[PDB]
């Protein structure tokens with residue numbers, strides 16, 4: 001018998017969209033959205049890669065930066081260490097690690113300074129829904 | 141030869157034509173038979189009183205295949221009840237493409253003329269792929285690949301693994317496997333239900349597709365703290381049963397567990413702004 005050993009690397013498709021309405025029904029297509037600060041924000045993250053049965057979309061950390069650059073030193077974390085932020089009451093999460101979609105809502109804001117644009121950047125970590133317990137329960 | 145010839149567009153040279161009296165004494169040079177009559181001369185001595193001739197002729201033997209050059213033939217003539225009673229000298233030459241040329245000579249006497257069978261207008265050349273040259277074997281056109289595509293051993297085999305987000309596929313050049321000596325190949329995963337098929341994106345490929353999960357075609361998943369890998373093995377054989385040189389394609393592609401994601405839509409807030417203006421002066 002002859003064994004040839006070959007391999008490869010693949011990527012999974014995870015998406016993020018702005019919801020035009022609460023309860024996360026319709027997505028947003030426009031290139032720049034113009035709201036008031038008092039208004040809230042409806043966002044969700046989709047998972048389109050595969051094996052949604054064995055995997056659960058789970059949010060580890062997310063933040064806001066004034067620029068498209070994600071590594072901006074000025075970061076307003078919206079989720080800290082798998083936890084919705086406690087010091088700000090207007091932050092709420094609906095599902096995290098529960099299913100293949102992660103969503104959350106928060107009041108809109110503006111970065112203090114000569115900054116007129118806000119960008120949102122999150123980082124996801126998939127998990128095994130049987131091998132490890134993916135429910136994040138956070139308390140101060 | 142292939143470029144300097146005179147075409148012949150006539151529909152009465154079929155071996156189905158009833159009867160005529162024309163004879164070809166003024167035919168001099170290289171000719172191509174094109175149209176409803178056919179592209180090749182008759183290969184068997186068609187019975188007498190056919191194809192607009194009292195005594196039909198026929199180029200005896202077999203049509204030369206591609207890359208044969210000048211071939212000398214002695215076209216026979218069917219008359220009086222004896223096939224090949226009179227003889228004429230012809231020089232048939234094959235050409236690139238589904239057509240031929242001949243050195244049509246003057247028969248010894250009139251009431252003699254050539255005529256063509258339907259031949260293989262059904263047998264086409266476009267069915268050969270881009271790396272498959274339009275070669276012929278004893279007059280039948282086939283798709284023989286590049287000669288430079290000649291690999292002997294097994295380790296040098298090409299393998300195109302695409303680790304798609306939802307499915308996984310592995311692709312191998314059909315020309316390479318034909319060169320390796322396998323007329324037909326058998327793709328089989330851990331389960332034989334995942335038999336391979338053909339697909340073309342830039343050439344002839346045989347490919348297998350397996351969903352990226354745990355068990356859809358017996359694929360095994362072993363996830364460590366950083367990556368999750370899908371491992372399955374492919375089996376190569378040239379017949380249903382193997383007798384030597386077992387082949388096992390140990391392929392596996394893994395996915396990351398962490399990734400970065402952001403909106404593609406710009407956000408712009410407006411907040412109530414109070415502007416207090418002050419001033420000063422200095423030296």
Ligand SMILES: *[C@@H]1O[C@H](CO)[C@@H](O[C@@H]2O[C@H](CO)[C@@H](O[C@@H]3O[C@H](CO)[C@@H](O)[C@H](O[C@H]4O[C@H](CO)[C@@H](O)[C@H](O)[C@@H]4O)[C@@H]3O)[C@H](O)[C@H]2NC(C)=O)[C@H](O)[C@H]1NC(C)=O
Nearest residue numbers: 007008009010362363364365366367368369393394395396
């Ligand atoms: C968790 O599992 C993952 C998935 O297997 C694993 O990542 C693997 O790390 C090993 C160790 O480095 C890689 O092994 C390969 O081994 C040979 C050299 O010995 C080479 O094929 C590889 O180097 C290649 O690196 C790049 C890959 O294209 C290229 O620059 C080039 O081809 C190099 O040759 C590599 O060292 C193995 O490839 C990765 N798997 C990947 C990258 O998908 C990880 O280490 C595991 N974590 C653990 C065990 O803690």
Ligand SMILES: *[C@@H]1O[C@H](CO)[C@@H](O[C@@H]2O[C@H](CO)[C@@H](O)[C@H](O)[C@H]2NC(C)=O)[C@H](O)[C@H]1NC(C)=O
Nearest residue numbers: 065066067068069070071072073074075119121
């Ligand atoms: C994103 O932001 C960083 C920080 O402003 C940009 O500059 C890099 O900064 C790091 C330290 O934060 C330095 O080590 C690098 O040398 C800097 N340059 C690069 C090219 O990384 C960085 O360029 C920005 N990235 C993009 C794509 O705009």
Ligand SMILES: *[C@@H]1O[C@H](CO)[C@@H](O[C@@H]2O[C@H](CO)[C@@H](O)[C@H](O)[C@H]2NC(C)=O)[C@H](O)[C@H]1NC(C)=O
Nearest residue numbers: 167168169170171210230231242243244245246
């Ligand atoms: C077909 O091919 C032959 C050989 O190339 C052509 O020339 C004939 O060659 C023979 C053998 O030397 C001579 O005896 C003949 O006299 C040549 N014929 C002529 C007309 O010069 C021949 O011409 C070709 N036939 C046709 C019809 O094109």
Ligand SMILES: *[C@@H]1O[C@H](CO)[C@@H](O)[C@H](O)[C@H]1NC(C)=O
Nearest residue numbers: 199200201214215216224227
């Ligand atoms: C014509 O072909 C037949 C069939 O093989 C053969 O018997 C005959 O001898 C051939 N004629 C000539 C002149 O070679």
